[PDB]
Design a protein around this motif. Structure first.
Motif, PDB file in Angstrom:
ATOM      1  N   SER A  12       0.803  -1.223   0.000  1.00  0.00           N
ATOM      2  CA  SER A  12       0.000   0.000   0.000  1.00  0.00           C
ATOM      3  C   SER A  12       0.840   1.279   0.000  1.00  0.00           C
ATOM      4  CB  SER A  12      -0.889  -0.018   1.230  1.00  0.00           C
ATOM      5  OG  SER A  12      -1.769   1.075   1.271  1.00  0.00           O
ATOM      6  N   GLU A  13       0.514   2.225  -0.867  1.00  0.00           N
ATOM      7  CA  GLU A  13       1.087   3.577  -0.812  1.00  0.00           C
ATOM      8  C   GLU A  13       0.071   4.694  -0.626  1.00  0.00           C
ATOM      9  OE1 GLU A  13       3.066   4.901  -4.331  1.00  0.00           O
ATOM     10  OE2 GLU A  13       3.921   2.880  -4.653  1.00  0.00           O
ATOM     11  N   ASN A  14       0.395   5.617   0.266  1.00  0.00           N
ATOM     12  CA  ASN A  14      -0.375   6.828   0.520  1.00  0.00           C
ATOM     13  C   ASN A  14      -1.776   6.603   1.071  1.00  0.00           C
ATOM     14  OD1 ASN A  14       1.786   8.238  -0.533  1.00  0.00           O
ATOM     15  ND2 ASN A  14       0.807   8.529  -2.545  1.00  0.00           N
ATOM     16  N   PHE A  15      -2.016   5.473   1.742  1.00  0.00           N
ATOM     17  CA  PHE A  15      -3.357   5.198   2.231  1.00  0.00           C
ATOM     18  C   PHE A  15      -3.743   6.162   3.357  1.00  0.00           C
ATOM     19  CE2 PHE A  15      -6.409   2.244   4.479  1.00  0.00           C
ATOM     20  CZ  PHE A  15      -7.482   2.495   3.644  1.00  0.00           C
ATOM     21  N   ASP A 110       0.282 -10.678 -11.941  1.00  0.00           N
ATOM     22  CA  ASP A 110      -0.421 -11.502 -10.983  1.00  0.00           C
ATOM     23  C   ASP A 110      -1.108 -10.671  -9.924  1.00  0.00           C
ATOM     24  OD1 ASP A 110       0.057 -14.133 -11.716  1.00  0.00           O
ATOM     25  OD2 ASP A 110       2.165 -13.897 -11.037  1.00  0.00           O
ATOM     26  N   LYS A 111      -1.263  -9.383 -10.186  1.00  0.00           N
ATOM     27  CA  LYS A 111      -1.729  -8.471  -9.170  1.00  0.00           C
ATOM     28  C   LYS A 111      -3.115  -7.928  -9.489  1.00  0.00           C
ATOM     29  CE  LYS A 111       3.002  -6.642  -8.595  1.00  0.00           C
ATOM     30  NZ  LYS A 111       3.742  -5.370  -8.853  1.00  0.00           N
ATOM     31  N   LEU A 112      -3.850  -7.599  -8.429  1.00  0.00           N
ATOM     32  CA  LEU A 112      -5.011  -6.713  -8.524  1.00  0.00           C
ATOM     33  C   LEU A 112      -4.497  -5.361  -8.031  1.00  0.00           C
ATOM     34  CD1 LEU A 112      -8.075  -6.260  -8.921  1.00  0.00           C
ATOM     35  CD2 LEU A 112      -8.392  -6.824  -6.497  1.00  0.00           C
ATOM     36  N   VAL A 113      -4.494  -4.338  -8.882  1.00  0.00           N
ATOM     37  CA  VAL A 113      -4.011  -3.038  -8.437  1.00  0.00           C
ATOM     38  C   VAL A 113      -5.176  -2.086  -8.302  1.00  0.00           C
ATOM     39  CG1 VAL A 113      -2.527  -1.102  -8.927  1.00  0.00           C
ATOM     40  CG2 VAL A 113      -1.797  -3.358  -9.601  1.00  0.00           C
ATOM     41  N   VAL A 114      -5.284  -1.467  -7.136  1.00  0.00           N
ATOM     42  CA  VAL A 114      -6.387  -0.580  -6.853  1.00  0.00           C
ATOM     43  C   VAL A 114      -5.853   0.826  -6.620  1.00  0.00           C
ATOM     44  CG1 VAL A 114      -8.317  -0.148  -5.346  1.00  0.00           C
ATOM     45  CG2 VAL A 114      -7.641  -2.489  -5.816  1.00  0.00           C
ATOM     46  N   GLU A 115      -6.254   1.772  -7.460  1.00  0.00           N
ATOM     47  CA  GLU A 115      -5.842   3.148  -7.311  1.00  0.00           C
ATOM     48  C   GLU A 115      -7.046   3.970  -6.872  1.00  0.00           C
ATOM     49  OE1 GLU A 115      -5.893   6.237 -10.752  1.00  0.00           O
ATOM     50  OE2 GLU A 115      -3.758   5.726 -10.594  1.00  0.00           O
ATOM     51  N   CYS A 116      -6.917   4.692  -5.768  1.00  0.00           N
ATOM     52  CA  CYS A 116      -7.988   5.513  -5.242  1.00  0.00           C
ATOM     53  C   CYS A 116      -7.544   6.953  -5.281  1.00  0.00           C
ATOM     54  CB  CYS A 116      -8.301   5.173  -3.797  1.00  0.00           C
ATOM     55  SG  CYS A 116      -8.224   3.465  -3.440  1.00  0.00           S
ATOM     56  N   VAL A 117      -8.408   7.821  -5.773  1.00  0.00           N
ATOM     57  CA  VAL A 117      -8.072   9.232  -5.931  1.00  0.00           C
ATOM     58  C   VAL A 117      -9.129  10.069  -5.265  1.00  0.00           C
ATOM     59  CG1 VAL A 117      -7.779  11.113  -7.527  1.00  0.00           C
ATOM     60  CG2 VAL A 117      -6.961   8.864  -8.127  1.00  0.00           C
ATOM     61  N   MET A 118      -8.687  11.033  -4.465  1.00  0.00           N
ATOM     62  CA  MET A 118      -9.584  12.023  -3.862  1.00  0.00           C
ATOM     63  C   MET A 118      -8.853  13.343  -3.750  1.00  0.00           C
ATOM     64  SD  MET A 118     -12.252  12.285  -1.154  1.00  0.00           S
ATOM     65  CE  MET A 118     -12.990  13.841  -0.663  1.00  0.00           C
ATOM     66  N   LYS A 119      -9.398  14.338  -4.439  1.00  0.00           N
ATOM     67  CA  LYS A 119      -8.729  15.603  -4.556  1.00  0.00           C
ATOM     68  C   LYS A 119      -7.310  15.330  -5.052  1.00  0.00           C
ATOM     69  CE  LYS A 119     -11.645  17.781  -1.083  1.00  0.00           C
ATOM     70  NZ  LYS A 119     -11.796  18.178   0.345  1.00  0.00           N
ATOM     71  N   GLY A 120      -6.295  15.865  -4.407  1.00  0.00           N
ATOM     72  CA  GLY A 120      -4.977  15.720  -4.996  1.00  0.00           C
ATOM     73  C   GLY A 120      -4.279  14.417  -4.663  1.00  0.00           C
ATOM     74  N   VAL A 121      -4.961  13.540  -3.932  1.00  0.00           N
ATOM     75  CA  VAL A 121      -4.271  12.428  -3.308  1.00  0.00           C
ATOM     76  C   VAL A 121      -4.548  11.153  -4.059  1.00  0.00           C
ATOM     77  CG1 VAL A 121      -3.942  11.132  -1.195  1.00  0.00           C
ATOM     78  CG2 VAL A 121      -4.616  13.517  -1.083  1.00  0.00           C
ATOM     79  N   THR A 122      -3.501  10.387  -4.333  1.00  0.00           N
ATOM     80  CA  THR A 122      -3.641   9.126  -5.040  1.00  0.00           C
ATOM     81  C   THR A 122      -2.991   8.016  -4.267  1.00  0.00           C
ATOM     82  OG1 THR A 122      -3.605  10.255  -7.174  1.00  0.00           O
ATOM     83  CG2 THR A 122      -3.199   7.880  -7.176  1.00  0.00           C
ATOM     84  N   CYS A 123      -3.794   7.034  -3.896  1.00  0.00           N
ATOM     85  CA  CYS A 123      -3.302   5.906  -3.116  1.00  0.00           C
ATOM     86  C   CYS A 123      -3.352   4.674  -3.996  1.00  0.00           C
ATOM     87  CB  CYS A 123      -4.170   5.760  -1.893  1.00  0.00           C
ATOM     88  SG  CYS A 123      -4.324   4.126  -1.164  1.00  0.00           S
ATOM     89  N   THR A 124      -2.355   3.803  -3.870  1.00  0.00           N
ATOM     90  CA  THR A 124      -2.265   2.625  -4.701  1.00  0.00           C
ATOM     91  C   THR A 124      -2.136   1.441  -3.781  1.00  0.00           C
ATOM     92  OG1 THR A 124      -1.235   3.794  -6.520  1.00  0.00           O
ATOM     93  CG2 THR A 124      -0.938   1.405  -6.458  1.00  0.00           C
ATOM     94  N   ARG A 125      -3.058   0.494  -3.937  1.00  0.00           N
ATOM     95  CA  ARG A 125      -3.022  -0.759  -3.197  1.00  0.00           C
ATOM     96  C   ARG A 125      -2.888  -1.985  -4.074  1.00  0.00           C
ATOM     97  NH1 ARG A 125      -4.295  -0.084   2.087  1.00  0.00           N
ATOM     98  NH2 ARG A 125      -6.053  -1.506   2.539  1.00  0.00           N
ATOM     99  N   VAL A 126      -2.002  -2.904  -3.677  1.00  0.00           N
ATOM    100  CA  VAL A 126      -1.782  -4.045  -4.524  1.00  0.00           C
ATOM    101  C   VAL A 126      -2.196  -5.294  -3.756  1.00  0.00           C
ATOM    102  CG1 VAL A 126      -0.190  -5.423  -5.828  1.00  0.00           C
ATOM    103  CG2 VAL A 126       0.102  -2.908  -5.754  1.00  0.00           C
ATOM    104  N   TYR A 127      -2.991  -6.133  -4.406  1.00  0.00           N
ATOM    105  CA  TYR A 127      -3.480  -7.405  -3.844  1.00  0.00           C
ATOM    106  C   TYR A 127      -2.994  -8.589  -4.706  1.00  0.00           C
ATOM    107  CZ  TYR A 127      -6.725  -4.173  -1.628  1.00  0.00           C
ATOM    108  OH  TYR A 127      -7.242  -3.074  -0.963  1.00  0.00           O
ATOM    109  N   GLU A 128      -2.693  -9.707  -4.074  1.00  0.00           N
ATOM    110  CA  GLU A 128      -2.260 -10.902  -4.807  1.00  0.00           C
ATOM    111  C   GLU A 128      -3.164 -12.062  -4.426  1.00  0.00           C
ATOM    112  OE1 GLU A 128       2.027 -11.458  -4.772  1.00  0.00           O
ATOM    113  OE2 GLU A 128       2.294  -9.469  -5.692  1.00  0.00           O
ATOM    114  N   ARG A 129      -3.314 -13.057  -5.296  1.00  0.00           N
ATOM    115  CA  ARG A 129      -4.235 -14.166  -5.033  1.00  0.00           C
ATOM    116  C   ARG A 129      -3.821 -14.915  -3.777  1.00  0.00           C
ATOM    117  NH1 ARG A 129      -4.095 -14.572 -10.602  1.00  0.00           N
ATOM    118  NH2 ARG A 129      -6.076 -14.345 -11.734  1.00  0.00           N
ATOM    119  N   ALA A 130      -4.800 -15.198  -2.921  1.00  0.00           N
ATOM    120  CA  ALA A 130      -4.502 -15.768  -1.615  1.00  0.00           C
ATOM    121  C   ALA A 130      -4.397 -17.271  -1.739  1.00  0.00           C
ATOM    122  CB  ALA A 130      -5.571 -15.378  -0.603  1.00  0.00           C
TER     123      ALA A 130
END
Ligand code: K7C
Length: 130
Positions: A12-15, A110-130
């Protein structure tokens, strides 16, 4: 499709900055930032279901692509959400109180990458198959 599976958060970055933009309080950011959620994505007919499980909170949404729906987020915001599939990417917008945040879920290697943006902020979360 490429999205169906059980996906475990690995990075996770910038969460924290993202949660701050959402208006989440310090004590709850602390707990949210160190939880390691699993995300279970399923599809049956028109309906896609995304269930998130964590030691802090669980959430589940079920939706049809392109159709607006009411959702209560993990931080208990009551939002209007619409999710569409755009060139392989699931694009969600959540709208509440004149505000909006966008969440893109994409499949990469092999990743699920989730990018969330709100105003100027961008958070990136990476998930892998369990
Ligand atoms: C079901 O809750 C899972 C947790 C979660 N909590 C929150 C708030 C609740 C506590 C403060 C923030 C948010 C906004 C998201 C989230 C992240 C990215 C998003 F794109 C959407 C929601 C997630 C989440 N969901 N899936 N992975 N992390 C993961 C870690 C603690 C709970």
């Amino acid at each position: 499709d490429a999205f169906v599976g059980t996906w475990k958060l690995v990075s996770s970055e910038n969460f924290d900055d993202y949660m701050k933009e959402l208006g989440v309080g310090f004590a709850t950011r602390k707990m949210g930032g160190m939880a390691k959620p699993n995300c279970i994505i399923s599809v049956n007919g028109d309906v896609i279901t995304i269930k998130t499980e964590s030691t802090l909170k669980n959430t589940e949404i079920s939706f049809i692509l392109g159709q607006e729906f009411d959702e209560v987020t993990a931080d208990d915001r009551k939002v209007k959400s619409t999710i569409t599939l755009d060139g392989g990417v699931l694009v969600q917008v959540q709208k509440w109180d004149g505000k909006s945040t966008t969440i893109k879920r994409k499949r990469e290697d092999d990743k699920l990458v989730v990018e969330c943006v709100m105003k100027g902020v961008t958070c990136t979360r990476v998930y892998e198959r369990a």
